[PDB]
Amino acid sequence: EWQENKSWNAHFTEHKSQGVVVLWNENKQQGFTNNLKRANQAFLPASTFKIPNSLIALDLGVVKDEHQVFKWDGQTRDIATWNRDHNLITAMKYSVVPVYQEFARQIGEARMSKMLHAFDYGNEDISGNVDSFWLDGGIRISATEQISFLRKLYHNKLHVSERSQRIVKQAMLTEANGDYIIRAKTGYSTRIEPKIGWWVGWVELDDNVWFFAMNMDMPTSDGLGLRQAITKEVLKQEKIIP
């Protein structure tokens, strides 16, 4: 069951942007979106790929645990937070592309392809460079496909160990207070048109879970804060969060 609520479009047009929000009520097994078409259009996953990438690296032993330090390679990059040592927690918090590029090289093309098929992730296509295919290669995923993947992760049903899934869900922790917990990952795709931002994850309540996946047009980095801001406005309107 899916229902289209075009009133949410106001949240995008009021900021003179365009995008889609997809919600899934786990208890009721019901979905909601403002745009059924865009909910099924496939985009580059960009840094949302750090979820599956982290899982594969952990399950193959490329990453030992969430404390292992990945030393800065000494190359000054334009993102200040990238020019320092990281572990899995901080690498995902600051979307540290260079750390995950090295993960992918050590994973290798063959094992990466095999695992993405086992995850049923997007179009499962790693065509391109092994260290950048999620940024400018052939892989694609829709918002509805993100939710399908995240639901498997939440229930520990992906084809990796329970430990790997618990560690990645820890690394996804974004916000927690007395009312809800959010585990999620942002994305920012600029190398292939259209330029978009992602935010995918879920909201934990006392007695239910709401999965979400949003993407929106991102002509400039000036609107990146809208990924979370717009999503939370939808959540408040639907009385999922206060």
Residue 148 falls in the annotated catalytic set: no
Binding-site member from 27, 68, 161, 170 for Cl ion (CB under 5 A): 170
Specify the residue, 42 or 224, whose C-beta has the smaller distance to ligand Q4G: 224
Shortest-Cβ-distance residue relative to Cl ion = 170
Around 77, how many Cα atoms within 13 Å sit in the side-chain half-sphere? 13
Specify the residue, 99 or 143, whose C-beta has the smaller distance to ligand Q4G: 99
User: Could you tell me the smallest distance in angstroms from the CB atom of residue 225 to ligand Q4G?
Assistant: 8
User: Could you tell me the smallest distance in angstroms from the CB atom of residue 107 to ligand Q4G?
Assistant: 22
Alpha-carbon separation of residue 150 from 105, 136, 218 (angstroms): 24, 23, 23
Q: What is the amino acid identity at position 122?
A: G
- Stretch binding Cl ion (CB under 5 A), from 19-27, 113-121, 144-152, 162-170: 162-170
Partner whose binding site includes residue 79, from Cl ion, ligand Q4G, none (CB under 5 to 8 Å by kind): ligand Q4G
Specify the residue, 181 or 224, whose C-beta has the smaller distance to ligand Q4G: 224
**Binding-site ranges for ligand Q4G (CB under 6 A):** 79, 94-95, 186, 188, 221, 224
User: Could you tell me the smallest distance in angstroms from the CB atom of residue 79 to ligand Q4G?
Assistant: 5
Query: What's the burial of 64, exposed, middle or buried (CB within 10 Å: 0-12/13-18/19+)?
Result: exposed
Around 135, how many Cα atoms within 13 Å sit in the side-chain half-sphere? 15
Q: Judge whether 50 is annotated as a binding position.
A: yes
Specify the residue, 108 or 219, whose C-beta has the smaller distance to ligand Q4G: 219
Tokens of 127: 């065509």
Partner whose binding site includes residue 170, from Cl ion, ligand Q4G, none (CB under 5 to 8 Å by kind): Cl ion
Q: Judge whether 113 is annotated as a binding position.
A: no
Partner whose binding site includes residue 186, from Cl ion, ligand Q4G, none (CB under 5 to 8 Å by kind): ligand Q4G
Extract the annotated binding site.
47, 50, 95, 227
Extract the annotated binding site for a beta-lactam.
47, 50, 95, 227
